[PDB]
Amino acid sequence: QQFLNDLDNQLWRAADKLRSNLDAANYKHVVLGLIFLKYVSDAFEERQQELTELFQKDDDDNIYYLPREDYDSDEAYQQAIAEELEIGDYYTEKNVFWVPKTARWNKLRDVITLPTSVSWLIDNAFDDIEKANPKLKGILNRISQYQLDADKLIGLINEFSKDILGHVYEYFLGQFALAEGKQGGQYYTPKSIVTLIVEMLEPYKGRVYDPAMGSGGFFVSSDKFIEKHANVKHYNASEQKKQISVYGQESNPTTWKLAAMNMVIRGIDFNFGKKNADSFLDDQHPDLRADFVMTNPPFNMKDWWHEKLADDPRWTINTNKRILTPPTGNANFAWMLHMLYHLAPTGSMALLLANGSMSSNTNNEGEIRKTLVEQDLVECMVALPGQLFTNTQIPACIWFLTKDKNAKNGKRDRRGQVLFIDARKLGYMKDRVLRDFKDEDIQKLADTFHNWQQEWSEENNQAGFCFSADLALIRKNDFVLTPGRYVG
Structure with a gap:
């Protein structure tokens, strides 16, 4: 090109x-x-x-x-x-x-x-x-x-x-990420993952939220997603972006300005709250109930807990009240829970995390991973190639959750159900060791998972790649959500 x-x-x-x-x-x-x-x-x-x-x-x-x-x-x-x-x-x-x-x-x-x-x-x-x-x-x-x-x-x-500088800003931002040796979604999430999450989420209309945005890559991604689906969808992309409002938060002072600078270049309207600030200690959007929640937060966060958080509503699951002991030595599930609390009853959320997330029992994660599932909130789990270009020093996976698994707007009543995928083998060798996705890999995974929402039986399973579980089999796999368990 x-x-x-x-x-x-x-x-x-x-x-x-x-x-x-x-x-x-x-x-x-x-x-x-x-x-x-x-x-x-x-x-x-x-x-x-x-x-x-x-x-x-x-x-x-x-x-x-x-x-x-x-x-x-x-x-x-x-x-x-x-x-x-x-x-x-x-x-x-x-x-x-x-x-x-x-x-x-x-x-x-x-x-x-x-x-x-x-x-x-x-x-x-x-x-x-x-x-x-x-x-x-x-x-x-x-x-x-x-x-x-x-x-x-x-x-x-x-x-x-004029059209260009957006691309020519987010490259530098990416490349200054690499050369600073500063890792984590607060610093940079590569185009691949951020395009995958967004593509699986499908943020067409509604309030869009990232509670730990970093430079706001997800919001760029969100905005582009609208643009490239315009044709086939036959809406006007310029007017479709009016159907999304952008909410975010980031505690790093210069990163917050890096984000605001980015939204301007992209010509995207944004609410990032009064100021940069910790999400746990100063939630800038205390009454936001967003339609799409997407984030790549800092993994295994220590130093995040404070006495004043005990008995925060965010640790109490509300599904048709469950009170969870929050993981004080790792923010990973705290984030999820914060996202969930800020999730509309019709909402869908996705987050990138460490594989430990899927099978660790440390930090009250077994209990939490049990409750989330028992309550049908988890909708899909993806394993990502360990080798993947992820900006994380610790290898990663995506959790996908809904509040609304009901039969609606194209989709079927998939209560009790969970779509596991293993993407471990997909992608191409970025360098000698790294892997990245082209939109074909992305597409597969986008397209796979949507269909499971739209029609699925044991025939559609795909050995080594995807499988459909219900509350029962996961209780046998002891609420370990690693896709490797469920196929090969």
Whole structure:
């Protein structure tokens, strides 16, 4: 297809040759913040452009039109145009943010002058951009802190000189994830897994929630999912995205800004709460009951429990009240439970976790894994290749849960039932050891699991790959939910 992979690489290498002393953790903020700054301009300078034509278009069905005949000179017509531009409504109406004189990219490349730092300029631009668009307050990672050499910054600005930057932002974000040696869904979830979960979830309409979002990869994924299914579905993708509202939370201060920066580039409306904050200690969405819940939280989280959490409603399952002792030495099930509590009665949730999840008895996980099942909340379990490109140092699996296993909207009454799949062999060798999925692998798994929702009997089982269990057989397998048990 395209240059994007090549273009990632061409900008990436040029951005590497300029990385000097900076720890990835700090450099990324210079690069990504810079990318953001090019986006906001382009979109704006493009919207100024497209308005420069609509004012001048002589057509009655056009409402933007400034009649030249109403004026007495060219220059006097230009002045009216220029003032009409200064009407903020035209930028908010298509989701363009006001970029002041100062912040504008095209202006900054040329401002070489002399000392009269260039780092001052960017930072000041961000500043200038923020006061102009309250919706964007706090979000811009300032880059004075990270004390890079001006000529590297200059050279950086030269190297970046509309549809694309989204891809060209999430690559860097991914690649700065790798090169920082910072692992976990709070830092980065690769496209594969995030496209799988989303594809299995099918977030068409409703409130979408991630309670530990990281850079918000799932929300990008969610948004794209709508786009690529538009045709076959025969809706208008632009209008379909209005049927989803985005809720999220993330406790890491800079990651929260990385996420908000990402949603803007993707032109996605977002609620990420008042501020970055712990989900357990300060749930930002205390009354959200979301339709889709999707997350890749930090695995085996220690240090998360506090006395003030005992007798949190989140530890009490409510299915047609069960009170669970929460796993104080590992947040894995706490997350799930938090997600569940925030799950509509018609909802579907999916999360990535460590395989231990499926068979460990530590941390009150046997009891919890028993109750979740006994109550028919678990809908599907996937095992993922240990080798899989997962950004996790500990190998992973997906849990899928519903509150509503009833026969509805295409799907059949599958109460008591659980679809196990083993994806251990699927995918291709990313490097010497890693594995990744192409959308064909994804597709299989998407398509398999939906069908089990739509029609399934012992014939559809597929030795080594999938199997359908009910409450009974899992009670014999002692609530161990590892797909390996159930087929081969």
